[PDB]
Amino acid sequence: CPVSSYNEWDPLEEVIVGRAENACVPPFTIEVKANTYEKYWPFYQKQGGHYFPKDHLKKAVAEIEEMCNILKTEGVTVRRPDPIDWSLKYKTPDFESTGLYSAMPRDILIVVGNEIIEAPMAWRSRFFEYRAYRSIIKDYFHRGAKWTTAPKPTMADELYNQDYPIHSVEDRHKLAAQGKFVTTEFEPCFDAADFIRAGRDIFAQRSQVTNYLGIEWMRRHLAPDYRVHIISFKDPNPHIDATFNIIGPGIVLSNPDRPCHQIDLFKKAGWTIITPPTPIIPDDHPLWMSSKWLSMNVLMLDEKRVMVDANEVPIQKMFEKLGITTIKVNIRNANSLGGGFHCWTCDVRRRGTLQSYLD
Amino acid sequence: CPVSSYNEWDPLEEVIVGRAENACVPPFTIEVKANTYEKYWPFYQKQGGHYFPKDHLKKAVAEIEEMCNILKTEGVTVRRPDPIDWSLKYKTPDFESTGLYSAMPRDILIVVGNEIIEAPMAWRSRFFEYRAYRSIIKDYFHRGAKWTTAPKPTMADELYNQDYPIHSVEDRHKLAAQGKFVTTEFEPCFDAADFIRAGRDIFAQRSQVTNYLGIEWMRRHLAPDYRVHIISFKDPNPHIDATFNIIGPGIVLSNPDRPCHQIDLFKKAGWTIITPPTPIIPDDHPLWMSSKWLSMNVLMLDEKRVMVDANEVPIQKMFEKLGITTIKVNIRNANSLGGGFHCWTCDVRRRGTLQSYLD
């Protein structure tokens, strides 16, 4: 069976790496605004609907191609999404919009066992993102994999708090604390990236794009074999792999700025919680999507080999003192699109079995 | 000044608690063999160079984290050594070896006044243990503390009796009596744990890992302000805090199986010598390092508060009849690594002054 992955660290064998090509700035709408730092609002305000700076995209393409080269060198089989023009404007009976990109396979596909799951998504500009990955998915399907599509939302106004009070990150973070997010519980929605796998236990978080109905759908769909737990963090930010990236059996990277409220569950489990050192990325480099914390958004080739940013020396040193071989790759420009290694990939096959690490 | 501790009982304020992570079985060499009970020789023989049972380490981590929680609850500031992979094989011009762990800060750091002292050590597998604690030490240094490193040994064959006749604990104990230990006086070596502080008088013992040159170095380095005395016990075992743990001004816990030859010096001083009751730890529980006497290896939070093993009821009752509040913590699995509370910690700051308790 080509598809088989139970966690984030077993020996990687096959992976899907995204594409920076024809990426479009999403129209500046409520759920987009709730996910971007003030600094960039005018960019989305003016640039919305057009491609991301073509000069910048060209540098991303180059960086990702090298990443793919190294992956092949490391013995990993690389598959890529199809080239597609995300500038096309589509219209459903509920809304009209243009696309985003097929850069982050982690945002939309998650693999549990022999099953590949397409996430519903929660952004209008990402409604038809799955189109970019259907060729790969049908191929695995013909080859034996189980294939699932979570219920695609309508994404009607009813799913969004049209009056979500975000005017700064300080408004979002307080509301978040209050349990207030731009998405309602009108219908199931979620980004696969708010789920991180550890064998029989998957951990998820309610976020701007993943609501509780989304989490219960997953919980209800994978049970009894898999337990989906909900954990929360201080100053929550969507996509868990940049706040709590699990890198080994009982070893996790906990972002110092976003401490987990349930850290004790893991302390009691005899888990090693590592706090990575601060990122060194220049504040002048643009990250239209995400935060500087992409430095901890690492991809493990196995327990002892990590693919880390070539520029983040401090975190490189940490892995090394720990006995983990750093495979330095530079993707500074690819980061602007909103993600690091874990985000730009989706592990389709890892050599290993299903186990419990929470005891 | 962050660093300030003159004895083992003044109100604890800051402490360093070790780590069970990535601990490695030391290669079965002469000085290791001289410190282990026959029962475990085949474990070291086969397991040497690999990690201690990962399932067991996971339980230790959990137990130590709770200990840290309680310490924080008791108002003690906790610092921890850095995560490091002790499986790395290093090579000096005299020998080659893998590491052990940074579990016992007491084995390597001792605080006298405002000075923090790194012990030389005497095991090849512990040559580079100091690496785990340098971040903390440099921090205290920048903050005003005095920092000292005793002369690091070469640990050439010349330091060890390649033919030390140990074949059983009955051979070691007789030789010990004869003044025969696995270490020679080729060069200074010692474990800080063979020193127990009582204000102006520090007591030490010649042991498998602490030779007379080691003791004279300390004696000569701390004089005139501090007097380092050498005491001896029946059936000596390295690390004095499990044979003669000083718990208060003139109150000491004397292991019934290892009576002190100089007990009269203390009787004459008007000191209270308490003989703890026998341990109740199961003989089936593995203690790769140490003896069951870890039960008396207590850590005093102050004169009236002791952190004692949650399972050793008999010794708990003793402290209680004495008016000392027991703070029960369970570290049954952490004990296997070779130590109790006093061993898993190193008091950096205690509220008090330098005094004489020997009159």
From Swiss-Prot, chains A, B:
Changing residue 30 to V: In CCDS3; uncertain significance; reduces glycine amidinotransferase activity. One of its GO terms (biological process) is creatine metabolic process. Gene3D superfamilies: L-arginine/glycine Amidinotransferase, Chain A. Changing residue 277 to L: In FRTS1; uncertain significance; results in GATM protein aggregation; GATM deposits affect mitochondrial morphology leading to abnormal and elongated mitochondria. The active site is at residues 191, 239, 343. Belongs to the amidinotransferase family. Homodimer. There is an equilibrium between the monomeric and dimeric forms, shifted towards the side of the monomer. This is Glycine amidinotransferase, mitochondrial. It comes from Homo sapiens (Human).
